[PDB]
Amino acid sequence: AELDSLLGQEKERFQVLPGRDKMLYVAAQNERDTLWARQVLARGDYDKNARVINENEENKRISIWLDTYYPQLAYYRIHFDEPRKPVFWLSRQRNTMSKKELEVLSQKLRALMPYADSVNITLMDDVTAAGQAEAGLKQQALPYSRRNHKGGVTFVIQGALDDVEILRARQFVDSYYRTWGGRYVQFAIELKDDWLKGRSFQYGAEGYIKMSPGHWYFPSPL
Amino acid sequence: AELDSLLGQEKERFQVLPGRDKMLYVAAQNERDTLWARQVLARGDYDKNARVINENEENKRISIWLDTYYPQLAYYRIHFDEPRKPVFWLSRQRNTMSKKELEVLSQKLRALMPYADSVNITLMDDVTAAGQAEAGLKQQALPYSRRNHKGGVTFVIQGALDDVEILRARQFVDSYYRTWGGRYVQFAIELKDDWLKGRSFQYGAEGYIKMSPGHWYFPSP
């Protein structure tokens, strides 16, 4: 009995890859089909060895190795659309490695993943990762507030939003966390009781003055 | 039978290593499988001697030996990502050890861990450990107050934090403590209530809180 017959009837939602360490890798697509395959190897109807990988946790398995041997590295995510050639999205304006010591990292990333053949390295730009998050946040017409600092930015969504302003903001972030991850940019959706959605002003003798962004907000009596 | 069949059906979560003191060490990953493996050696279905090691428990045993024979040593953590060649993160800006007295430490540390083949000692910087922690604390948008002194800094978080800040704070400290450890930088979360809820007050240099229309409070500078 081969491997792709002991799984379900639909033989296209999974993807069996041959390993290099004499193992066999099955490529699921979500956490629901992961427990479908892990029940097979746990009930024990397969003779040889087999492992289960996943997008959200193999990006965690080689980030635990990565923040020990290569600290202060700026990267976003590893995409696994074709598992024989992964793509590593580095930062261009924050990484200072030459061509000789970037080829050592690709051969060292090869030893962590015995199913992969060659890891592809490209240098993604750093302001494009902030422009898509800003122009995508103005497109939904959401009252936000940007805080620029060194080595990552952050966007705060304060205020008493209603159900449509929560549903549009929550839906855009999860379609953005899939692409770039949460290493650089972090979203800060929070509900407080102020009808003024985030902003704050002080008033004297000339009009209103826009205050510097702080954590304290005035609670609204209306 | 041999040990790798006496464990569970999933032959992937444990990895047995033969020791130098005529033992066989198994390297688990959390406390849920160490009690699984220690149940095996306790019920007694194995003739020889064996042990179950861990990342954090072995990181406290070889720190008790180190503060007896080598006190006033500045280090952070020993990383156990590959259990046959561990990496020791020593500090740079706080010790004056030469190359000749680093080989005595790297050869006397091998005899305490019989499973390892060699220890790779690297000298980490001291400002990047606190520069990634301060910059990591602004990204979560938390109010704080850094107090610097000689041989360690600390960050104190105060205020009426809401429920999203006490979940982003636990997900950040446990990701930083997992890498560097709690030897150099320590956080102190303490939460108090707001004295200013329905009260009117003046802020700035001469700050005071009006607890009632006829009651003033002059706080500490």
Binding site: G214, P221 | W195, R199, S200, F201, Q202, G204, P213
Partner: peptide, 26 residues
């Protein structure tokens, strides 16, 4: 434990006597 950065007077439903007495130093 008074989290604000600048200088100023915050008034929550004052009765125009404790408000204008606070402006009696400027």
């Amino acid at each position: 434990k008074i989290p604000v950065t600048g200088s100023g007077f915050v008034a929550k439903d004052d009765s125009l006597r404790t408000f204008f007495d606070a402006m009696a130093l400027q």
